[PDB]
Amino acid sequence: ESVKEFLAKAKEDFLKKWETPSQNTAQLDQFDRIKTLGTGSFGRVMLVKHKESGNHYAMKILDKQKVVKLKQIEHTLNEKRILQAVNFPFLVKLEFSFKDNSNLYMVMEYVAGGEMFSHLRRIGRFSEPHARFYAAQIVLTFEYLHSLDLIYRDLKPENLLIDQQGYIQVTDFGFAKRVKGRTWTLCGTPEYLAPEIILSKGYNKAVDWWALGVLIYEMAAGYPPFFADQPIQIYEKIVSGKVRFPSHFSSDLKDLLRNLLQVDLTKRFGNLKNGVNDIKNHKWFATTDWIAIYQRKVEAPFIPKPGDTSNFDDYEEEEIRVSINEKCGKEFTEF
Amino acid sequence: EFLAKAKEDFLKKWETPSQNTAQLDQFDRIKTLGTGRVMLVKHKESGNHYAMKILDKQKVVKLKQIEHTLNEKRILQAVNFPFLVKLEFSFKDNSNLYMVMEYVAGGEMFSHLRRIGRFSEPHARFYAAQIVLTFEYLHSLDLIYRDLKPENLIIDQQGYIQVTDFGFAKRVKGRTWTLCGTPEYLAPEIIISKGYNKAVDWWALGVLIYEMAAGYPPFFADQPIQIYEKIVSGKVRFPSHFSSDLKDLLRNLLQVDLTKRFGNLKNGVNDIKNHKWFATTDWIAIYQRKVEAPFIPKFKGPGDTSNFDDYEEEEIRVSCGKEFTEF
């Protein structure tokens, strides 16, 4: 199976860069600071132009001191260390990284289309061939990531960026862990959490299969399967398990979701011995060409409108000052 | 005039405190109330019940909390206000600090809120007014409380709020930088490290009011960092059942912009006290506690802890002393 063969060349390469992460692949003065695309609690994201190439990138400036104050040290190293070892069409690309006395830097491909969350909200919902298009992309990405013993743990619409070509690109690996065994952290959003997680059972990759089940549902309906304005009720409703499908759900879609949204870890699609094949063959994915999608030779249902931050917000623009003094030097040397 | 005198007696006490007015062998430690550890105690002689906060000298140190704890003690013992728990005694049994306070048998607001889910706006308004006044009091002494939240507000027998946990209160004419509090209640300034002031409590009030009315707090997640991101976003969605006047108030309280945050402007509290949500509030009436509580916890008699959860009881024995000289 070319499928099995390609994931090994992939494991291999992931593994090289994983043992030997790439550091300082650029520096601040190679870029022009155009615009602040977003802000956070220990960093922001800036639209930049690489001076020599003339290409635009989304650049992440993490204030090293803030990162330590908020205890995000390894979460930070971990995301960087992962993005930098990873390579697949539908994951945002880390082009360059590097650091100052003051900051940490992560230059990503700029994806202007914004995130599926807004779009889905904007337009209400997605046709099933529409939803299936995005769904196909996730299945592959998980197949890839899981191959590397990586749990994503953060599937949700606002984490799926939509490129000019209309394809999904996954962002934010803060909570992704390389885990052979089982793990216990509560971290992903309430609507996408699997029963196991909520019961502090100690979960594994099958969680992402649960979450995919939720994404598909929301993409097809315009709301998640376990919704409630009260946080605690979101949790109860998941553990309960009762899922109702809008009239307009193909019998195929219903069947998929029953197998994805499945408490019985022994019967959940993804965790069985037949693997992702159970999903990739399911009757709801008959009209989908898996290698064409991987190669992006499949026409996308939607496309979003040299910059500019059109589909973004406006923010108070701050100087990127750098101390003459090296800050928190010891704890980030692995970056 | 009042504040003037309150600012006086608070000063007198703040510079002539009381220490070691009791001893461990004067109470029969009945049960654990909360979790450090707090125990329901009953005094031998008096026979009255109190709540005894027992602080482990060595974890305090190992956790670098000496100023903070020397502090709550110092402040608790010097404040006087209808909705502030009274410190009745204090002393160190040579291995851990002991603060003895009035017992407030009604329980955390927390457990009642979770049990019920959410209070009505009139119920919520009743509590809010009390904190609004308690903060005015406290700010007037130039104090910042910095630990507002349901699990820190006890309901007394009449259904009036009693504030415990002064763990993080500091006297701050000016500005401070310490990052403490509890994630869901932190204002952007304190997360964001460009220093902050007492306006941080009014933001917290907005969080409490919202959580009371709604049942959950405005910025919610299962990890603090995620909560911080939501707070910095500063973006808030309100339940549809929220009244418009309620919606208004929270927008003014949960203002990132210190320049338009209610309570931190020209009229101080009066902007809050005079807002349309509070129209039906007799503030002098609440201060005197001549308002009938919409809710009263079930108290049976001396020593009932039914309003509190159960907890394992470890023993408290004797064997880091030099550091608490003035405790």
């Binding site: 509560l186 309430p190 909520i198 502090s200 946080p231 605690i232 949790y235 109860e236 553990v239 | 956790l63 955390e108 927390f110 979770r114 630990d147 939240k149 699990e151 946990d165 763990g167 993080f168 990052l179 403490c180 509090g181 509890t182 994630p183 869901e184 932190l186 959950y216 919610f220 997640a221 299962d222 603090p224």
Partner: peptide, 15 residues
Amino acid sequence: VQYLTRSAIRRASTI
């Protein structure tokens, strides 16, 4: 049923 979500359990002060 005891859910460990910060929407159910007592939230501890930022240590």
